Description:
Blueprint: E1 16-20, H1 23-26, H2 39-44, H3 62-75, E2 80-84, H4 87-90, H5 100-115, E3 119-123, H6 131-137, H7 145-160, E4 166-171, H8 173-182, H9 203-230, E5 233-239, E6 242-245, H10 250-273, H11 278-284, H12 293-299, E7 306-309, E8 313-317, H13 329-332, E9 336-338, E10 340-341, E11 344-345, H14 360-372, E12 378-382, H15 393-397, H16 400-418, E13 423-429, E14 448-450, E15 457-459, H17 461-470
Parallel strand pairs: 1-2, 1-13, 2-3, 3-4, 4-5, 5-7, 6-8, 7-12, 12-13
Antiparallel strand pairs: 8-9, 10-11, 14-15
PDB class: hydrolase
Keywords: beta-alpha-barrels, oligosaccharide binding, transglucosylation, hydrolase
Assembly: monomeric
Amino acid sequence: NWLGGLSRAAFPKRFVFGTVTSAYQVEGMAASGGRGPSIWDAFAHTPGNVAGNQNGDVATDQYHRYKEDVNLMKSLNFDAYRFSISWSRIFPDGEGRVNQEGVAYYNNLINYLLQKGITPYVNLYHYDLPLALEKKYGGWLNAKMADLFTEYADFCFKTFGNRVKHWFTFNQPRIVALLGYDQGTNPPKRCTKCAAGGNSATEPYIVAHNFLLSHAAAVARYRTKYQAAQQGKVGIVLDFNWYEALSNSTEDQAAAQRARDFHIGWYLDPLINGHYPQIMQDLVKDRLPKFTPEQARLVKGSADYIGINQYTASYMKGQQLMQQTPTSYSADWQVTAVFAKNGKPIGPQANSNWLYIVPWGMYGCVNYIKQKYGNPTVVITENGMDQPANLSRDQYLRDTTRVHFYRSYLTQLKKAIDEGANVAGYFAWSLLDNFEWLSGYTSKFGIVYVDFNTLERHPKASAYWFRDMLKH
Ligand SMILES: OC[C@H]1O[C@@H](O[C@H]2[C@H](O)[C@@H](O)[C@H](O[C@H]3[C@H](O)[C@@H](O)[C@H](O[C@H]4[C@H](O)[C@@H](O)[C@H](O)O[C@@H]4CO)O[C@@H]3CO)O[C@@H]2CO)[C@H](O)[C@@H](O)[C@@H]1O
Ligand SMILES: [Zn+2]
């Protein structure tokens, strides 16, 4: 049938199903309600940076419409909602003065979610560093971010933690490091060539290191001050796309494993084992920061669960590892991504050029984490696909490809869980069509259609698929 034998009975007892948004992508009221600017506000308001010079000033206006959106997610039989708190909406300058109107918004949101029986899963950070912190401290280049983030996290735990029991610190630090500091295509637009300055060979590693230290510090604060009373959990969200060896050659198998290590091992080896992957230590050498023993012990075991954002897969082709002059994090891997095997593409692309529809990548990623890292508790924190711009409403609603996407990816996830993977939940990116970073409003990831002229919500076929699949 159209569910393909999927239902709540097909997953573990108490398995959590949710949808996901992030603050800047959906909230709107970017310069209102006392919110201070983030690095994304400054970036998106610069001509040329975003498709059509668009920005998140209004976005989906969830700020005003949150009760409509919560009613909708409940009507679709979800158990949970992953959203993020905008740091600069709480602390307009990133430190010091609290914006009480901002606090009130998140209180109202959290309270309504709970009233409607939806569990809040709350991200502290989703790319939206307060602009004041970027200017004053140099953002994630500065080790002082650990202190600054911890104080912000402390406030959130104190203010919301009696109700919020499921936290995440960061979202995809790999992408911040890569796009913000290697390629320089996301704020702060740093890179070797870039006008803002930077160094693609060193800064991504500094930034990743500071994310890990900041995460660890915030979790240490949670555990020592709040956890006894609040009895919640704190994790982190990491992107992981699957890498499959192009052939069974030694070089190609090594390349696939090297890619896994530079992609997910970069964060998981510190979080699980207390060190960076050996291959990164060997290849990146002096450009890879060293944890002190005390720091490594703070970082190891500091995630109660691992959020994995899983979208896609590629093949990897290898070659002889060679001595080379350092140029970038990306070039450090010494691999070649390949998107076809035996003359056939790995999968068709969704609207985003990077997003190949490869359901077996979900199995690959989950099974790999199970086998490599001692089967830690995993939550699939994002999974989804996008439609292009300029379709009619009815074309958006008839999202047959997305229905197929979810049925196939969830079937592969089920396969991994049935084989013993410790997966505790699954969250669809996204509840709503939203502001998709560089793509602005030209990329539509929602299971619910948003008319960006009127702001009206209309559930797509995929929303009704979930409703049918998830009926209690
Ligand atoms: O976009 C939807 C949603 O997803 C979350 O973030 C997305 C980013 O928006 C997107 O830019 C990012 O793109 C990745 C892509 O997934 C990777 O497959 C690719 O990986 C490279 C690797 O870096 C290379 O070194 C290697 O050689 O090749 C591989 C494969 O080509 O890199 C690109 C970036 O350049 O994907 C993210 C998810 O993975 C956000 O959380 C959410 O807010 C977004 O709305
Ligand atoms: Zn409004």
